Copies of this chain bind each other. A is one copy, B any other.
Amino acid sequence: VFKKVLLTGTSEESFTAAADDAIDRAEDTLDNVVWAEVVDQGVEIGAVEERTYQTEVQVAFELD
Interface of A with B (CB < 8 Å)?
A: 1-10, 13-16, 19-23, 25, 27, 32-38, 40-47, 51, 53, 57-58, 60, 62-63
B20 pairs with A47, CB closer than 8 A:
no
Q: Name 9 extra pairs, CB < 8 A, besides A1-B10, A1-B25, A35-B42.
A: A3-B6, A3-B7, A14-B16, A19-B41, A19-B53, A20-B43, A20-B51, A33-B46, A35-B43
Nearest opposing residue in chain B for A6, CB measure: B4
Specify how many copies of this chain sit in the oligomer.
Answer: 12
Q: A8 is contacted by which of B2, B40, B41, B47 (Cβ under 8 Å)?
A: B2
A21 CA / B3 CA spacing, docked (Å): 12
